[PDB]
Amino acid sequence: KGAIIGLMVGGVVIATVIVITLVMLKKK
């Protein structure tokens, strides 16, 4: 039951990724 949810908070990790690439475009 809890294992299924672990997928929800999992995708939220995509946020930091989106920002990480952006941090590269900020200085270029």
Added chain:
Amino acid sequence: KGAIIGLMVGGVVIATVIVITLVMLKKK
């Protein structure tokens, strides 16, 4: 079944939010 998953892609929306506030700090 599909309704439960709709929660997964749901949180992913938190990404745009995080970026939105950042876009404000970029020019200030």
